[PDB]
């Protein structure tokens, strides 16, 4: 109905209050994963904070990152995800998943979900970036094969849009 101001508003303030209550890496990791699944990507559960979610995500990241440096052994910052998983094992899992994808629709959701679950600070930056690059290579190879082969009418059905208007 009526948006509040862009950069300072009650939605961002409410989420800042929630973030301030996070006191452990485990708690903040569940918080950020739940947040990214709920509010990010075309497959998000809700657009209710659309104009604020990117700023809020930044603030969650900052909280988790400081909790990591305050609470974790330094070596874990290099070798582990904040889920407790080994970072190289996460890379191996998700590369294998996308290499097994049978369509661009399976592959796109694998890549999107990898980012929702493991975007830094969950996974170390160097491991994340090289995994994201490997996944994107495969996703593009599948998507860009015969890119113009399906008519728009077919793509609309494959995507699953509800068509609300087509100008004559």
């Amino acid at each position: 109905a009526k948006r509040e101001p862009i950069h300072d508003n009650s939605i961002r303030t409410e989420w800042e209050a929630k973030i301030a209550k996070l006191t452990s890496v485990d708690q903040a990791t569940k918080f950020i994963q739940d947040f990214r699944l709920a509010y990010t990507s075309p497959f998000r559960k809700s657009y209710d904070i659309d104009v604020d979610y990117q700023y809020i995500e930044r603030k969650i990241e900052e909280k988790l990152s400081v909790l990591k440096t305050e609470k974790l052994p330094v070596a874990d910052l290099i070798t582990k995800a904040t889920t407790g998983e080994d970072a190289a094992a996460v890379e191996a899992t998700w590369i294998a998943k996308i290499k097994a994808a049978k369509s661009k629709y399976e592959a796109e959701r694998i890549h999107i979900e990898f980012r929702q679950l493991y975007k830094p600070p969950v996974l170390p930056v160097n491991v994340f970036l090289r995994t994201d690059a490997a996944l994107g290579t495969v996703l593009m190879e599948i998507r860009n094969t015969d890119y113009y082969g399906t008519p728009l009418e077919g793509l609309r059905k494959e995507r699953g849009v509800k068509v609300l208007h087509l100008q004559a």
């Binding site: 101001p5 497959f43 999107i112 090289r130 996944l135 068509v163 609300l164």
Partner: protein
């Protein structure tokens, strides 16, 4: 020995060093690009220009000294900064600052291409462009810096790096000349930047801007842009060498023409309407009708000759070229309606076409008078220029059923009920959100790649808010804190303030609520 030696005077020329550059890279297992890509640039690729760092600096510094002499010595003595027709001085607020973001993002794009290449020579060609695009960022900045000091209206010349964020035309510039340059397969980015952006648009555009500028009294922009132009052939060559470097990869036959067609459509979707609008409506003295210019630049020079030279590497002219040409007749006039109607969201002072301009438009675009001419004349009669009127044409558009939509992919505005161009509205709901698309090529991009295209539009951010509050929050005011930067006329009297905007009660709707 210690007594005998050849004492002839010798130095070492740049090409003598460059001969050895290819040998500077070495083999190791991890020596490969970090970025996602479908292609492999061949390790033996060469570069056309044999430029080493010392010679790079020598050649660019010499150009700078001539340029800054003209600007800071000669033109200042002539008072030339205030001898520009106001319409054009206002247009340069937008042209220089919007092009600046393309220069800036091209730095990062060229560095990503340097990362993509393996051959030291190909890396070095991209590196020269990295440095040139820094130069050009500071050159566009310098134009607006000089206008800020010497032109009668410094507002908007002096703060566009924040005030551009208020308005809708900035979002489309970010697609073609910021995000399109850096977000994707490096080869897709190279086609957006070098093969299309520069070879099709920037190379002739930079020169054309200088012709419109000099015609309208601006000698600042020719001084700078004619120097920028001397660097561009090296960047077009980088794009050529991108294609050469992948020609033996089987991936090129699978993928290259798709990336090229998508990039061509991307670039033209913005520049076809926007450049014609800035040239024809942002000028007093006219150089050439945009419809003629577009056909020469895009269809003949680029789509024919320049892309033809890449046929030996499997490149085809874009499948979407004919569709682009069909929209180039009226697209910029359609855009003019939106730009004039939403003037308070800009950072420039606009001028409705006067009687002489109207005659020029109808002579070169028969049919203009009976459509756009009548609309503009009605807006003037309703008080377009008059701050006491409470009249802003975006509200007239809504009252008369002429809704404005934003393409989710290109960010370009579309008014289907008034458009003479070829766009057509598609509205889809996906996972609880509605999306408006405006052509077959962009709709395909969105349907296949929805996670690449999640840009919030001005109606989504500003929904239900009153216009003067948006402008004030975005700093769209002069130093008195109340007079708008943007204006609907170019005169020195009767400038609009926040209170004058508030009188209109313009509150942003959700254009997709009806669907």
């Amino acid at each position: 020995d210690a007594l005998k030696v050849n004492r002839a005077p010798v130095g070492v020329e740049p090409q003598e060093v460059h001969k050895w550059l290819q040998s500077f890279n070495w083999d190791f297992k991890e020596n490969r690009t970090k970025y996602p890509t479908k292609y492999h640039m061949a390790n033996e690729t060469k570069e056309q220009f044999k430029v080493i760092a010392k010679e790079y600096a020598r050649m660019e510094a010499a150009k700078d000294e001539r340029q800054f002499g003209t600007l800071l010595d000669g033109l200042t003595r002539l008072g030339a900064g205030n001898k520009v027709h106001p319409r054009w001085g206002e247009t340069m607020k937008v042209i220089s600052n919007f092009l600046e973001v393309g220069e800036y993002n091209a730095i990062a794009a060229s560095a990503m291409l340097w990362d993509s290449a393996t051959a030291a020579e190909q890396k070095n060609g991209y590196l020269a462009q990295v440095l040139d695009e820094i130069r050009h960022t500071h050159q566009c900045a310098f134009i607006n810096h000089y206008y800020s000091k010497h032109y009668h209206d410094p507002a908007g010349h002096n703060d566009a790096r924040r005030t551009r964020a208020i308005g809708p035309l900035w979002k489309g510039m970010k697609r073609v000349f910021a995000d399109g340059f850096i977000s994707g397969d490096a080869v897709e980015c190279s086609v957006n930047l070098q093969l299309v952006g520069e070879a099709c648009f920037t190379n002739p555009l930079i020169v054309a801007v200088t012709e419109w500028a000099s015609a309208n009294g601006d000698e600042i922009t020719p001084t700078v842009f004619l120097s920028v132009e001397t660097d561009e052939l090296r960047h077009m060559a980088n794009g050529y060498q991108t294609v050469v470097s992948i020609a033996n990869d089987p991936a090129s036959a699978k993928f290259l023409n798709t990336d090229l067609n998508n990039a061509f459509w991307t670039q033209q979707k913005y520049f076809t309407p926007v450049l014609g609008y800035l040239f024809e409506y942002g000028s007093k003295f006219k150089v050439e009708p945009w419809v003629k210019t577009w056909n020469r630049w895009v269809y003949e020079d680029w789509g024919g000759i320049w892309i033809g030279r890449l046929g030996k590497y499997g490149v085809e002219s874009p499948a979407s070229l004919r569709d682009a040409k069909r929209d180039a007749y009226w697209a910029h006039h359609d855009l003019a309606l939106a730009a004039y109607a939403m003037w308070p969201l800009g950072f420039a002072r606009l001028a409705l076409p006067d009687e002489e301009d109207q005659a020029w438009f109808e002579a070169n675009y028969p049919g203009w008078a009976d459509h756009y001419g009548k609309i503009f004349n009605e807006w003037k009669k309703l008080g377009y220029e008059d701050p006491k009127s409470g009249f802003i044409p975006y509200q007239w558009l809504l009252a008369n059923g002429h809704d404005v939509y934003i393409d989710r992919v290109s960010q370009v505005p579309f008014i289907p009920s008034l458009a003479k161009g070829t766009g057509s509205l598609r509205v889809h709901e996906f996972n609880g959100k509605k999306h408006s698309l405006t052509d077959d090529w962009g709709e395909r991009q969105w349907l296949i790649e929805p996670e690449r295209y999640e840009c919030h539009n001005v109606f989504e951010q500003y929904e239900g808010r009153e216009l003067s509050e948006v402008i004030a929050e975005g700093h769209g005011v002069r130093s008195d804190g109340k007079t708008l930067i943007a204006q609907p006329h170019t005169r020195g009297d009767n400038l609009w303030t926040l209170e004058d905007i508030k009188r209109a009660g313009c509150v942003f709707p959700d254009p997709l609520a009806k669907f």
